[PDB]
Ligand binder design. Sequence first.
Ligand SMILES: [Mg+2]
Lengths: 278, 488, 121, 230
Amino acid sequence: MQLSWKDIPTVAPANDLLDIVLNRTQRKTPTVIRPGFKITRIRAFYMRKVKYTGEGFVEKFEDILKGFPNINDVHPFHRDLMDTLYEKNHYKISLAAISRAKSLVEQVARDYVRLLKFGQSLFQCKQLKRAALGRMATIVKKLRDPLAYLEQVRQHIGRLPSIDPNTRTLLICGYPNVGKSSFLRCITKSDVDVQPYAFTTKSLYVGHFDYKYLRFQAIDTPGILDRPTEEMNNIEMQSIYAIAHLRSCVLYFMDLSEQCGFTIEAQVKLFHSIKPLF
Amino acid sequence: STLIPPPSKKQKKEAQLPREVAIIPKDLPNVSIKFQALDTGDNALRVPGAISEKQLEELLNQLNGTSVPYTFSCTIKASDPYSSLIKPQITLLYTPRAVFKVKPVTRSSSAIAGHGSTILCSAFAPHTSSRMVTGAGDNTARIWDCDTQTPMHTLKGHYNWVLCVSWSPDGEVIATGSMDNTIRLWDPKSGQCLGDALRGHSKWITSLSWEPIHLVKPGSKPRLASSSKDGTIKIWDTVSRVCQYTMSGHTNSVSCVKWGGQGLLYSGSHDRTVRVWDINSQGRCINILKSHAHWVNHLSLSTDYALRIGAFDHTGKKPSTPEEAQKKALENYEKICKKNGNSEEMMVTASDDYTMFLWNPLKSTKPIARMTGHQKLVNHVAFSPDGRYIVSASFDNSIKLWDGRDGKFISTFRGHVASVYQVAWSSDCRLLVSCSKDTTLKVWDVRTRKLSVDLPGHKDEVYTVDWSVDGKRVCSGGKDKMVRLWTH
Amino acid sequence: VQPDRRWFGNTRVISQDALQHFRSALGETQKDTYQVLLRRNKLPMSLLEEKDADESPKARILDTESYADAFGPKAQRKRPRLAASNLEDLVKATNEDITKYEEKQWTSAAKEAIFSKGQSK
Amino acid sequence: PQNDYIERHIKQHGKRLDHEERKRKREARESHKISERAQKLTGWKGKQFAKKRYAEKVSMRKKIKAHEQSKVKDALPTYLLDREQKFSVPLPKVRGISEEEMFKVIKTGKSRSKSWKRMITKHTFVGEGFTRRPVKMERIIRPSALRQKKANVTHPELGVTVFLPILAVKKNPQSPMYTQLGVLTKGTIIEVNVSELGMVTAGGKVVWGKYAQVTNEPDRDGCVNAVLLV
RNA sequence: GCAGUCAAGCGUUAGCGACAUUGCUUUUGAUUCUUCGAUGUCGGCUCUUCCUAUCAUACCGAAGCAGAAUUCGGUAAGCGUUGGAUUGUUCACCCACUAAUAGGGAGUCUGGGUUUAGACCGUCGUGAGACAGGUUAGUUCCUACUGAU
RNA sequence: AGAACUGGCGAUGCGGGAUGAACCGAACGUAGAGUUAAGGUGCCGGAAUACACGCUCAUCAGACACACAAAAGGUGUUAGUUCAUCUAGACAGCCGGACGGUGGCCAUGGAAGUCGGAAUCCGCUAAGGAGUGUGUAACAACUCACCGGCCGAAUGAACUA
Ligand SMILES: [Mg+2]
């Protein structure tokens, strides 16, 4: 989906998730089995427990995979924003690792279920179940770092703006501390800090205002320093990507005053070099 | 011991029947042929018969008025390198043969019970292969007389592992970088540290790069460049041992550095960045390259081999005065560097991400070609002494050969069964010797990309090997704490 | 189990020369439908296999930068890597990507239970 | 939506008056609550709490030791650094698995009185040449689910485990009729394709197969472990 | 699990060993289209009774929880946990609606089947004979509770 | 699993162990007197709701074929070992110092100690970390590591039962 995927279920870390899964398996399944019980019944109980644990893990992994925004082919602007924010390659690699772990868990559960139905002694079935649980935990254990990184980016992705470039939009841009943040605050019914430093609105805040019986949205960005197109920060890269992808003209601001102590020649040269964006 | 399936009755019957003969004295076919120099020279049209290759080779001699023999090849799909003329208009090509041929190294030799530690490095002396030096875990380095296969004076003075050791191109002073913080100087006959050791380095020395003789002015000794984990390269004066300037552009460890013939020190670093530092620029970076996905693990250049010989060609004749020695170094450097008319020392950078990049530091920063055909990190990449061939060693148990200029893949060796470590190039480019994690040494025939011979004997972990300048002998060393020599 | 010069002794050593012949045979071997196999020889197919299929899969980017450094409170990615060198080519890339993206641009009764095959163990 | 502004709002309203006091009081009460819970959290919970407390104490001790040590103040090539690293068998006198239910009997026919069938409940490896005979001849049955072709192999050198195909079984003690049956029966010596390691014996004859002894019990585990006899 | 690694402690006091720790443990959300000899009678209807290792409702708690809504630790059995579907076995999966349609034991009217009925196809044998399958036919007031004199 | 060896039941009554075919005692005719083994002396249950040294708060302690879920953990209790602080003022409580080069060096829109990371210096003293935390765009703002102003007599740390 689009437009604030915050609905992701904010998965707990690997240790917490494993503990929750194990507790659920213990609680939702019978526990008191005795050697005197028939071998068939004991084997069926063990297989049911193993299958329940495997299905729970598979459902959790599938829900995690589905909840994500499906960065691939979602949108060039959104794709570039996500790449800048969370280093797209790492996010894709983490998702691939999660999928591989889910596949390995499925294979392990299937193999143990197939093998479990042949153990004769109750101790053999117990050992097979313990080995299956240990294998599942070991598979989950290595997933700690990708899971934590995905949780962090989700905590950040959920609060990201939500706008459609295809719609009618007008943006504000220019040098930092030019009063651009104040202009955004005044022009539209949006609240943004107006502190006098060159990185007031670090995030790309979205403003909305109505004119001619039509809604007109706007965005904010600190702008670009000299930035000869080789050394650019993530914040400025996001602004460059937004300017490149976004719709009709973005307003270019220039502080013709003592503040913003870059010579007006530098301001002119900035837009002259950015001309290809026009 | 597995047995190859023995030939069946059909094979025996076929073998028992005689077949064609190779006398070929009669009815030599004639077809149009053209001559064109391999590198640049396009040309001497003729329509001769299926004459002997020697006659064809001598035919071009009078054309250019050289008297020199030239290697010959044609069709450069066909890929064809009387026997060759019977396969079918064939476009023939020529290039210098470099008549000096290094005899293949096949025979082994007894081990030497020297320093009892794992070998780390080794290099042949440029003036003569009779003397060789090896580095190992022991803090002391030792020279070896290859003729008698005996140790020489012990380079006492170091208190940590000698990471790198190598003769200077002129052979006057040996450099042996120590693990802890220092590099010491040892002339071939000192037997003791020459003055105070070079100190003041925050981290261990990764590699050394001597100043080429062709750039060294008469009288002044060559400068010694060093690289370390600290991410900086210090230029040391061999005479005063003082450091003129230090560059800290690299944000991570400098994997290696090579003193190019143009005065530019091409070095790679763990920061995935290549900085072309130059002495003539008072220790300043002229350009920076950033294309590797992973960090740079090794660096090499086409003209690097010519620098290490220091005008001491395969004949081994020492020069008389510094001026004539410098002139002979410069002429050889021009010969190798000016292969394609103009002096262009091609550069190749080894990338751990199963990829290698071809670089031309003297021109635009756009990569010439992206050599990428490996499955594991390429431990070592070295240009062929001729310059037309490029080889690389990787942990994937294979050695890959690539074109020297166009980057086209050539062939891949698979004799090694374990990770392949650094390799060495023969003095005539005819044979390549490689060592791997496996306890075996192998040499590959470049003429047909086939295994020539296997040279086992090392206990295990043959870390490095080198080829003599004259090609008479090949040395080796490994974790076995025993140095072993090899000769034809 | 009794000690002896048995296991801990070499038993399966292959011949160095035979490896090249096996590789050549594997490269040249060909079969047709009218030809069938009865006994597949036991040979080190791993060494024979893995021919010159140069593809060089993608680099291990995670090794250069861990997940934690990529994003989070301990961020170490203040600047993007491999970003576009110029604005013009970046604009062109965005334009063609947008064009490609534009180019791409209660329910009926469920399945009958009769389809229990080829399920149904 | 609306990125990290919540921090902005906190800065414009500033840590609600009782928040800091309540947080401090809760932190002070944390020790008392932990002590009380040390008596609460009964069966199936107190064990986990004690294990977590022991792990935390061990971590704290190891961190304190590291700080105390810090307050006081195998050579490798230049390319391998900065990179990741009397002939008795190891396990003599293996457990004496008896001729018992392991040869599980399966009742045959509609009237279960002429079973005559024995089933092996132990892991067995056969390979390509299995070729199940007609059902009438199945005197001994090795289930497919209990068949493994790749067994884990390791040596006390670099600690590298690599799954390798099982080549054959040469000597199974305790009635080697099991050897003839190809059963694993931990304590057996089996051949493994060691081509992956590529170790080469003297003379340049690369080795690709060595005999290894099964260390773990495949009957009680879903994996097979063996140690190279090098 | 195997083989180590650090080593809180016990040590003949050279060895052990708690917790962590490395290698099995298609890096580009690709699709494995994999689901591998459970020889045993159980399976499903209704109602009651007991547990909590509790699904909803109820209780409060920790969260990038701003709301809607969502992830989870804990208290709680008071009341609820419905309806269709296969059989070319239902050792189980699908989706109507709800806030959820929680897991078990104490077996107790109905259908497979657990057994001699009689027969058949093929297996096996010189044959009686029985099966690696399988189909047809089937029959199994004594005491305690609820009302009254 | 297996051997030799000892006792009881086997073939067995009697007191106690709620009861147990293997437990503790115990030499089985019919009665009387007095002393005991095993169990106890709040009732069933015949005998002190006896003396004396301490522990035990337990949400079902404890009186349990002694067998292991049993290793630690409790800002729960009682008693002990070792090492230092000490009237050259014992621990804990209220107040100030917490410097100067310095805003270290490379990373760079910001890392002034608390987003990256190598050592962590010298000047300086009662003492100062190129920093422990709380929090800032940037210092800034507050605490201790460590010291002093008042107090005012034993205190802190690791182990054992
Ligand atoms: Mg501003």
